[PDB]
Design a protein around this ligand. Structure first.
Ligand code: NI
Length: 341
């Protein structure tokens, strides 16, 4: 059964609610982004209206085979009417196609559902600036002060400098990057760009990237592994065994691998700066875990909420334990007392 925090009161709507069968009284199903914990349940057999971004709709149609007549893509930053209710989709600074959803209820209540997001000050000058929000359904993934991580720009700087140094010292080194879903494309695209290479990948991953409206993508990616010195592999293969095995398949073209695992947060964040990150090495294979996050840090989250000043917060992440829930509620009260709302 659908949980309460996926239902939008006063409407016929749900958010990211496809794994519960036919939801009682739901007249339109919103999907914030194409990640499997959110889309779980969609297929060619779905016959209700799905509302989403253009990019998310390209992925629904091509990867899951949802029929076109049930996909309702909306432009961003544009007031739209859905079953008699005004809605706006806003960029979530998550993965490609990811949105937040503003709902203007008939009674005057305004609700913002962040989906998954990485809060940014640029959001303080979207259509959010123009009215009060009463209720916030918040991505609380990293809602605790231990979660610090660097900007995306610093992490990409580190990766590009590390890759360009390694390959310049050894023109026979291969760079490998791990992936298991959309998001974090900048990692592999920035490395390929500095090395003057395309990114080589499976046909299935190339199909996924072609759904994303990224400019000049035919210029940056390829299925010809032989012509590429940056390869993408499933995240599961980014270990010493999987990478040794890959290097065998390359037929003596390469004699070293430098691999990157973009993770979210790991506890090495609490002690070490990005400058200071070092790999795990075995033989001719080095693996770097880099803290490239597509979710808010604690401080970024705090800043957004203190700016927005909602009347009520509904967390959407870490809701399954009483200790998590209590911890999050204590932070929300601190933020409200410190800022004065
Ligand atoms: Ni996500």
């Amino acid at each position: 059964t659908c949980p309460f925090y996926k239902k939008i009161p006063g409407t016929g709507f749900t958010v990211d609610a496809f794994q519960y069968g036919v939801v009682e009284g739901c007249t339109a199903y919103f999907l914030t982004h194409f990640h499997s914990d959110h889309y779980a349940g969609l297929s060619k057999h779905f016959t209700f209206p799905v509302y989403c971004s253009e990019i998310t709709g390209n992925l629904l149609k091509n990867k899951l085979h949802v029929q076109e007549q049930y996909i309702h893509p909306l432009p961003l930053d544009t007031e739209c009417i859905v079953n008699g209710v005004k809605v706006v989709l806003l960029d979530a600074n998550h993965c490609p196609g990811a949105v937040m959803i503003l709902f203007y209820l008939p009674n005057g209540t305004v609700i913002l559902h962040t989906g998954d997001f990485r809060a940014d000050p640029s959001m303080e000058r979207s259509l959010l600036a123009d009215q009060k929000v009463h209720m916030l359904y918040l991505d609380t993934t990293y809602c605790s002060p231990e979660y610090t991580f660097p900007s995306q720009q610093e992490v990409i700087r580190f990766a590009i400098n590390t890759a360009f140094e390694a390959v310049t010292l050894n023109p026979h080194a291969l760079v490998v990057c791990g992936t298991y879903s959309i998001g974090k494309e900048k990692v592999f695209l920035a490395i390929a760009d500095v090395l003057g290479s395309k990114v080589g990948m499976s046909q299935e991953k190339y199909k996924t990237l072609q759904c994303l409206n990224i400019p000049e993508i035919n210029s940056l990616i390829t299925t010809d592994m032989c012509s590429s010195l940056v390869h993408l592999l499933p995240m599961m293969q980014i270990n010493f065994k999987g990478l040794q095995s890959h290097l065998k398949k390359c037929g003596g073209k390469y004699n070293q691998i430098l691999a990157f695992r973009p993770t979210g947060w790991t506890h090495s964040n609490k002690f070490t700066r990005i400058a200071d990150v070092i790999p795990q090495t075995k033989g001719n294979i080095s693996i770097y875990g880099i803290p490239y996050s597509e979710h808010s840090s604690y401080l970024e989250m705090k800043r957004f909420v203190q700016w927005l000043k909602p009347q009520k917060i509904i967390p959407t992440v870490n809701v399954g334990t009483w200790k998590s829930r209590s911890t999050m509620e204590k932070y929300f009260r601190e933020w409200k007392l410190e800022a004065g709302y």
